[PDB]
Amino acid sequence: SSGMNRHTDTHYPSLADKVVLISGGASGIGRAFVEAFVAQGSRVAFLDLDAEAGQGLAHALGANSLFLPCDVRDIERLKACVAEVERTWGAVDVLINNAARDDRHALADVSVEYWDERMQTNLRHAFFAAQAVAPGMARRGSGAIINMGSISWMRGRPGMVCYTTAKAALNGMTRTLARELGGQGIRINSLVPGAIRTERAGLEAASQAFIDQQMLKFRLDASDCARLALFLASDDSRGCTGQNFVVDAGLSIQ
Amino acid sequence: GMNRHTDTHYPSLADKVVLISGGASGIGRAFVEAFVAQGSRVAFLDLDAEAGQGLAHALGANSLFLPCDVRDIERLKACVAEVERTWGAVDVLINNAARDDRHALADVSVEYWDERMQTNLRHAFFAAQAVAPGMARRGSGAIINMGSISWMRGRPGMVCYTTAKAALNGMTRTLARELGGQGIRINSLVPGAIRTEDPAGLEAASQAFIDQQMLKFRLDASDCARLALFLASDDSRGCTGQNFVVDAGLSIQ
Amino acid sequence: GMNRHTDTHYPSLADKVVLISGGASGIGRAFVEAFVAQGSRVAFLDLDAEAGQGLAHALGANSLFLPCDVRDIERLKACVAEVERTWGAVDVLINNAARDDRHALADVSVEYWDERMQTNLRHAFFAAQAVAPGMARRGSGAIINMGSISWMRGRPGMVCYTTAKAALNGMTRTLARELGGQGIRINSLVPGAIRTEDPAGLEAASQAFIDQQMLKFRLDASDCARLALFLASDDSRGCTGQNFVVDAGLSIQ
Amino acid sequence: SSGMNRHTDTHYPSLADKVVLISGGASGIGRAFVEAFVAQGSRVAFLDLDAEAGQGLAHALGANSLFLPCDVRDIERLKACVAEVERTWGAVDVLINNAARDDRHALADVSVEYWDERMQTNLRHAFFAAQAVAPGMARRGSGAIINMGSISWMRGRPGMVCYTTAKAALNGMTRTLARELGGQGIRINSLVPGAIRTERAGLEAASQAFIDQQMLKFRLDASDCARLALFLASDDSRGCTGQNFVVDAGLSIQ
Ligand SMILES: NC(=O)c1ccc[n+]([C@@H]2O[C@H](COP(=O)([O-])OP(=O)(O)OC[C@H]3O[C@@H](n4cnc5c(N)ncnc54)[C@H](O)[C@@H]3O)[C@@H](O)[C@H]2O)c1
Ligand SMILES: NC(=O)c1ccc[n+]([C@@H]2O[C@H](COP(=O)([O-])OP(=O)(O)OC[C@H]3O[C@@H](n4cnc5c(N)ncnc54)[C@H](O)[C@@H]3O)[C@@H](O)[C@H]2O)c1
Ligand SMILES: NC(=O)c1ccc[n+]([C@@H]2O[C@H](COP(=O)([O-])OP(=O)(O)OC[C@H]3O[C@@H](n4cnc5c(N)ncnc54)[C@H](O)[C@@H]3O)[C@@H](O)[C@H]2O)c1
Ligand SMILES: NC(=O)c1ccc[n+]([C@@H]2O[C@H](COP(=O)([O-])OP(=O)(O)OC[C@H]3O[C@@H](n4cnc5c(N)ncnc54)[C@H](O)[C@@H]3O)[C@@H](O)[C@H]2O)c1
């Protein structure tokens, strides 16, 4: 559907028919991944807690898009959602650990219950999702995992300690997983966005603030993220593992 | 009788109130002994009661052992409040308690992951949260997060421990910014392969670390403690947000 | 007959003007061939005239070989100006020319150091300086600095080469900021141990890199070229100031 | 002399009588090193192109301070200055590569002659000085090298490409030298300052700008640098090599 963003004009033959799985795929950046992979002719499954948003997107993208309802805090349902994907299409080729929650919170405000919840939606699934797809990949001898990272912890960003600390956690989980699974043919990297404009006056000011702080004087959008994801998924990046790829218009270096 | 760990003397450490988690054994013990030798008032937390009691008794009246399982945040909070009740606001927090037991990626259950994160990461946040208001009232404080080179070197077979350690690398930066306007500096102390209490199997493993290191000698707990004293003292007053790596070059191979 | 290096097709590369130093052989050749396959106009510089001539002849009318010894800044400037005269402003500069010959710390003279810095670092600055005004007039441009993991891994026995490579790591960041307001993005492409044209001695060394890598296969020039195409294309339009490391995990050990 | 800053109250017995060599020692940060080591009772030699500044400082600090005139661009004189130090006191214990020139310069303005000169005063000496002191150290089985680094290249600071690129060069030269010389007992690290107030209206504003950007809301001065240098020199840091130690009040993380 010409209504839905293709995100790039580039064509990656190596993505055709690969099985892709994206968590938090129904909105924002996750939606752009879902769109971009479908446009390259992958078989794309995504998970999201918003069922009516997920259903609309699968309906718009057609039969090579699959929407599986899932709350990533429930590891049981996450492993079930994985098993379903592997049942329908085979072993996953490309896992994108994207689901996350970046609501702001002062350090003094944080209760034990909040911290545990935030760690569960922000960090713990990426581990269990990678744990779930790994053996299928290993059986085949190949696959790719992308962990969505953030420059927020790199820039020491205050006021959201559970989210920045999870993002920092994934930076390290990428390296060690890379080592643990590389012998099996599985490459793992972190895609690290800067300030991506989405849909999640004073808005104009905040937007100009980013442009003033960035090296490249235009705003980043979800397309910039998906363009990096397609490269990281494709055979073009087959020797890259353990690494961060930062798409942030220079905002992390100031 | 006690390991003093350095002949250096830091006048700025005299009388400072120092709180260390997992202080009864290993690295944490070395911190406890080193800061006591500098004249600090040192409170430490540990779930090993017998080890903690013995150590406090051996070090005397400027050591205080509080029993605490760091997974229990309420007890952690209570231990902090009691330190502040006895000696006033903490000057120096060292988030040290950790469990680095090996575990294969394939075998980790939800429950293991939650517990390993709670032992290895969660408490460092809550301990910081507990000491911050007392620090801010006084206008000064230092926090030291014990880090690890293991995640930097992509070390396999202990994903919960390395991921926690990588978590604290980020938590250092962001809390440094969030609290530094209150006068609180926060850094991570990042050791390499520290020797701590098949003879050939041990000897061989120890030789392998020497062979891979740039400096050809084994590191021990004293190396750690000497870095911590500097990171606590007024000599590092302007350092915040940073890692300081004591690893004989093991991380650069 | 030619290595195309990828089956990927980047429409944004069609007709772009690409300048590569040390393009006649090895990695630089792979760049030359890969961008020509995408429909770009590719100019390359090299001191090996016979290799450059043959390559331009083999690739045809959208390849231009300019003889150039990159230590000679005046010639470097002249080659840039001639590219701009034939095809207009450069779209994509790849600072590639380097010499990585081994040399012991103890034995390096002033003259060796100066020459090794001139071959390995200086030209990348001047080449950037030469292409920047033409980029700025058009409002867009990309620069790629070929980096190395060797300094990151503290590799001994070639101090001039590793120090140059570490120099470009910093030069990437600062030129990214200085030129990005003009629309010019700058990144470093950082390969691991790339196979390029005692059999047991070679086989063993190659096996050692496989053993230390995370992915168990040897990297080649094509791996490099496929990253460069992405870093040149509109797919990386928002990436600047950054390293992109293609090393099969060799740098994380 | 009570007139001269001691920089710390800390006492390091392991520094007593060690031989220290500092390039660009007569002014600013280099002067603070010279003062701090003398106060710990080291034998301190420094090099500087400003003879009358160097003479004044050696006169003020007394007989365990030695001032050797030197233009660090002249590698010959630098190796001679080293040989003199080793002749008078033995092998150097602690080398601090501090001399540098941070005049601003637009990228378009830079001529070949400028670039080569700047690289010579900013980078090339640190290599040759480390080359000169190394064999004496190796003979003894011990020593320490500190390379003065800068957060400027880390923060992608524009308008001084020769200086930031040299600083970036030394970041890498620290790692590789660490490996090359570690078997000999020589440890090498980079001391990396933030915005240090020195003596090198609108000044007040610029100063407030740093405080606003820093995490810790006070200015850094030369003492902060020397306090780190003494630790890096002493036996207290005997297991630390190959590393950066950044003293910048959080300015690099923003
Ligand atoms: N916005 C940016 O500038 C930016 C920058 C850096 C990193 N990122 C990262 O990009 C990724 C995508 O972020 P986004 O901005 O599109 O977020 P978003 O919240 O706009 O959309 C993410 C999706 O995740 C879903 N989701 C949230 N909780 C979930 C749960 N428990 N189970 C299942 N689905 C759940 C949301 O409903 C939504 O569908 C995240 O990893 C985030 O950290 C974003
Ligand atoms: N040993 C090394 O090579 C090494 C290397 C890198 C980093 N580190 C870091 O050093 C720090 C100290 O480590 P160590 O090697 O001495 O560890 P250790 O396991 O020997 O000792 C840690 C201490 O914590 C206590 N402890 C553990 N769990 C606890 C809990 N739930 N409640 C209370 N106390 C608890 C233990 O009883 C022990 O006294 C840790 O943060 C570790 O991450 C150690
Ligand atoms: N080979 C690897 O494993 C590897 C690893 C990391 C980084 N790199 C980087 O890859 C880039 C390409 O390297 P390579 O391995 O193909 O090197 P190479 O030495 O095989 O080829 C470099 C090319 O530059 C040309 N050249 C050298 N000096 C020149 C000069 N003064 N004037 C003009 N041309 C000159 C050569 O003639 C050759 O064609 C270099 O920047 C190197 O730093 C290579
Ligand atoms: N100022 C800061 O905020 C800051 C920040 C980061 C790094 N640094 C670094 O700190 C170190 C000291 O800098 P500073 O600010 O005190 O500089 P300064 O210029 O104030 O004093 C440095 C000394 O070096 C001398 N010198 C310069 N050229 C020389 C030459 N060719 N031969 C011999 N001596 C020479 C100067 O005359 C002076 O005596 C340098 O390595 C600099 O990069 C400074």
Coordinates of N, CA, C and O and ligand atoms in Angstrom, one line a residue, chain D residues 23-31 33 47-50 70-73 97-102 121-122 148-151 163 167 192-198 200, ligand 4:
Chain D
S23 N 57.2 18.3 30.7 CA 57.4 19.1 29.6 C 56.4 20.2 29.7 O 55.3 19.9 30.3
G24 N 56.8 21.4 29.3 CA 55.9 22.6 29.4 C 55.6 22.8 30.9 O 54.5 23.2 31.2
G25 N 56.6 22.7 31.8 CA 56.5 22.8 33.2 C 56.5 24.3 33.8 O 56.4 24.4 35.0
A26 N 56.7 25.3 33.0 CA 57.0 26.5 33.7 C 55.7 27.4 33.9 O 55.8 28.5 34.5
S27 N 54.6 27.0 33.3 CA 53.4 27.9 33.3 C 52.2 27.0 33.6 O 52.4 25.7 33.4
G28 N 51.0 27.5 34.0 CA 49.8 26.8 34.1 C 49.8 25.4 34.7 O 50.3 25.2 35.8
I29 N 49.3 24.4 34.0 CA 49.1 23.1 34.6 C 50.4 22.4 34.8 O 50.6 21.8 35.9
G30 N 51.3 22.6 33.8 CA 52.7 22.0 34.0 C 53.3 22.6 35.3 O 54.0 21.8 35.9
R31 N 53.1 23.9 35.6 CA 53.7 24.5 36.8 C 53.1 23.8 38.1 O 53.8 23.6 39.0
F33 N 52.0 20.7 38.3 CA 52.6 19.4 38.5 C 54.0 19.6 39.2 O 54.2 18.9 40.2
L47 N 61.0 20.9 31.5 CA 61.4 21.5 30.3 C 60.4 22.6 29.9 O 59.2 22.4 30.0
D48 N 60.9 23.7 29.3 CA 60.0 24.7 28.8 C 60.8 25.6 27.9 O 62.0 25.6 27.9
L49 N 60.1 26.2 26.9 CA 60.8 27.2 26.0 C 60.9 28.5 26.7 O 61.7 29.4 26.3
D50 N 60.1 28.8 27.8 CA 60.2 30.1 28.4 C 61.3 30.0 29.5 O 60.9 29.6 30.6
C70 N 64.1 24.0 26.8 CA 63.9 23.1 25.7 C 62.7 23.5 24.9 O 61.7 23.9 25.4
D71 N 62.9 23.5 23.6 CA 61.9 23.6 22.6 C 61.6 22.2 22.1 O 62.5 21.6 21.5
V72 N 60.4 21.6 22.5 CA 60.0 20.2 22.3 C 59.9 19.9 20.8 O 59.9 18.7 20.4
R73 N 59.9 20.8 19.9 CA 59.9 20.6 18.4 C 61.3 20.0 18.0 O 61.3 19.4 17.0
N97 N 54.0 14.0 29.8 CA 54.0 14.6 28.5 C 52.9 15.7 28.6 O 51.8 15.3 28.4
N98 N 53.3 16.9 28.8 CA 52.3 18.0 29.1 C 52.5 19.1 28.0 O 51.5 19.8 27.8
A99 N 53.6 19.3 27.3 CA 53.7 20.5 26.5 C 52.7 20.4 25.3 O 52.6 19.3 24.7
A100 N 52.1 21.6 24.9 CA 51.1 21.6 23.9 C 50.8 23.0 23.6 O 51.2 23.9 24.3
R101 N 50.0 23.3 22.5 CA 49.7 24.7 22.0 C 48.3 24.6 21.5 O 48.0 23.8 20.6
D102 N 47.4 25.3 22.1 CA 46.0 25.2 21.8 C 45.4 26.5 21.2 O 44.2 26.8 21.3
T121 N 54.6 20.3 18.2 CA 54.6 20.8 19.5 C 53.5 20.0 20.3 O 53.5 19.9 21.6
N122 N 52.5 19.5 19.6 CA 51.3 18.8 20.3 C 51.5 17.3 20.5 O 50.9 16.8 21.4
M148 N 49.2 13.8 28.8 CA 48.1 14.7 29.0 C 47.2 14.7 27.7 O 47.6 15.1 26.6
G149 N 45.9 14.3 28.0 CA 44.9 14.1 27.0 C 44.0 15.3 27.1 O 44.4 16.3 27.6
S150 N 42.8 15.3 26.5 CA 41.8 16.5 26.5 C 40.4 15.9 26.1 O 40.4 14.9 25.4
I151 N 39.4 16.5 26.7 CA 38.0 16.0 26.4 C 37.5 16.6 25.1 O 36.4 16.4 24.7
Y163 N 45.1 20.6 17.3 CA 45.2 20.3 18.7 C 44.3 19.2 19.1 O 44.8 18.2 19.8
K167 N 45.5 15.4 20.4 CA 45.0 14.9 21.7 C 44.4 13.5 21.4 O 44.4 12.6 22.2
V192 N 43.2 13.2 31.6 CA 42.4 13.9 30.6 C 41.6 15.0 31.4 O 40.5 14.8 32.0
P193 N 42.0 16.3 31.3 CA 41.3 17.4 32.0 C 40.1 17.9 31.2 O 40.1 17.8 29.9
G194 N 39.2 18.5 31.9 CA 38.1 19.3 31.3 C 38.5 20.7 31.2 O 39.7 20.9 30.7
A195 N 37.7 21.6 31.6 CA 38.0 23.1 31.4 C 38.7 23.6 32.7 O 38.0 23.9 33.7
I196 N 40.0 23.7 32.6 CA 40.8 24.0 33.8 C 41.0 25.6 33.8 O 41.5 26.2 32.8
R197 N 40.7 26.2 34.9 CA 40.9 27.7 34.9 C 42.5 27.9 35.2 O 43.0 27.2 36.0
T198 N 43.1 28.8 34.5 CA 44.6 29.0 34.5 C 44.9 30.6 34.5 O 44.1 31.3 35.1
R200 N 47.0 31.8 31.5 CA 47.0 32.0 30.0 C 46.1 33.2 29.6 O 44.8 33.1 29.9
Ligands
LIG4 N1 43.4 24.3 29.8 C1 42.6 23.3 30.0 O1 41.4 23.4 30.2 C2 43.1 22.0 29.5 C3 42.2 21.0 29.2 C4 42.6 19.8 28.7 C5 43.9 19.5 28.5 N2 44.9 20.5 28.8 C6 46.3 20.2 28.6 O2 47.0 20.5 29.8 C7 48.4 20.6 29.4 C8 49.0 21.8 29.9 O3 48.2 22.9 29.4 P1 48.2 24.5 29.9 O4 46.7 24.9 29.8 O5 48.8 24.6 31.3 O6 49.1 25.2 28.9 P2 49.9 26.6 29.0 O7 50.2 26.9 27.5 O8 49.2 27.5 29.9 O9 51.3 26.2 29.7 C9 52.0 25.0 29.1 C10 53.4 25.2 29.0 O10 54.0 24.6 27.8 C11 55.0 25.5 27.4 N3 55.3 25.2 26.0 C12 54.6 25.5 24.8 N4 55.2 25.2 23.7 C13 56.4 24.6 24.1 C14 57.5 24.0 23.4 N5 57.5 24.0 22.1 N6 58.6 23.6 24.2 C15 58.5 23.7 25.5 N7 57.5 24.2 26.3 C16 56.5 24.6 25.5 C17 54.3 26.8 27.5 O11 55.3 27.9 27.3 C18 53.9 26.7 29.0 O12 55.1 26.8 29.8 C19 48.5 20.4 27.8 O13 48.8 19.1 27.6 C20 47.0 20.8 27.4 O14 46.6 20.1 26.3 C21 44.5 21.7 29.3

